[PDB]
A paper describes a structure:
Here, we describe the structure and function of the first member of a family of protein phosphatases that is specific to fungi, protein phosphatase Z1 (PPZ1) from [name]. Like other fungus-specific phosphatases, C. albicans PPZ1 (484 amino acids [aa], 54.4 kDa) has two domains: an N-terminal intrinsically disordered protein (IDP) domain (aa 1 to 170 [PPZ1Nterm]) and a C-terminal catalytic domain (aa 171 to 484 [PPZ1cat]). Furthermore, not only is PPZ1 important for cation homeostasis and cell wall biosynthesis, it is also critical for C. albicans virulence.
Both the MC-free and MC-bound structures of PPZ1cat are highly similar, with an RMSD of 0.54 Å. The largest difference is in the β12-β13 loop, which contains Cys438PPZ1. This cysteine forms a covalent bond with the bound MC identical to that observed in the PP1α-MC complex. Unexpectedly, the Z1-helix is also no longer ordered in the PPZ1cat-MC structure. This was not due to MC binding, but instead the Z1-helix was displaced by a symmetry-related molecule in the crystal. Importantly, the positions of L1 are identical between the PPZ1cat and PPZ1cat-MC structures, demonstrating that the conformation of L1 is intrinsic to PPZ1cat itself and not a consequence of Z1-helix binding. MC binds the active site of PPZ1cat essentially identically to that observed in PP1α. The orientation observed in PPZ1cat-MC is favored because a malonate ion from the crystallization mother liquor is bound in the rotomer position populated in the PP1α structure; thus both positions are expected to be equally likely in the absence of malonate.
Author numbering:
A (entry chain M): 1 to 7
B (entry chain A): 172 to 438, 442 to 464
Amino acid sequence: XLXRXXX
Amino acid sequence: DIDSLIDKLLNAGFSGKRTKNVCLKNTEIELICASAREIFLSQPSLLELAPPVKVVGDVHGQYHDLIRIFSKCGFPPKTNYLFLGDYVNRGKQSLETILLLLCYKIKYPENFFLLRGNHECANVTRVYGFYDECKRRCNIKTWKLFIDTFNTLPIAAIVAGKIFCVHGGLSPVLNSMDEIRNIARPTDVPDFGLLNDLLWSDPADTINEWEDNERGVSYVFSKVAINKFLSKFNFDLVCRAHMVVEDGYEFFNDRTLVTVFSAPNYCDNWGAVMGVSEDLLCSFELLDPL
Ligand SMILES: [Mn+2]
Ligand SMILES: [Mn+2]
């Protein structure tokens, strides 16, 4: 979820 | 004096000291990137390693957790190491993380190995933190010296002719291992092609062998892709990283592939490190999130 480039 | 630079880096790591400036001067950082780059270029794009060896996944600048890995799994050179990439970005100590790994590479060139991850390139570091960390804590010239070093990192490793190690995964155009050997270095990472796939792709339980990857680039490959790849090259296991997994490591497709992720509490996942014995037995050591 940190941004899908990837939680 | 590579020994003193390691002691300085590990001093800051043992104490947890957190400072804007790196414990190494920019002139020392420059010499480290120069020696490592030369060592990387003198070794193949596809490494062939013999066991025993321990395999480490994504670290992503979590320097304290790199210290925990070495403290628990053993410091070089009594433990032989293969890192699968993704050393920088996200973590607030990407500089200490990559600097310690490069120093160990300089000191133990034949017992310590670092593969390239998809974050070890110019464009990804500009988006995900390591560019800004170099600009704030060092300078842009130092960041360029790291990218020059990244562009020489090897792409994959084969352990005892049976374990294929890569950061991301497989590719529809991985038709021979020499295609990995013949990857010219130094090189940037293109938006497409075999090199991009090896650093960006992920496994999945999909209906089709190849599908576009939700990350926005490269592919996701199915169990069929793994089976065909292991059969064609006579490998027993694909060992890769790239993907965060809750229990630190996760086998896939009847234990024909394993993901090793070594950055605890990345988003509250465990961290894991895979050991390969002389008889090619695979065990794991865990790193708790907190
Ligand atoms: Mn990755
Ligand atoms: Mn990663």
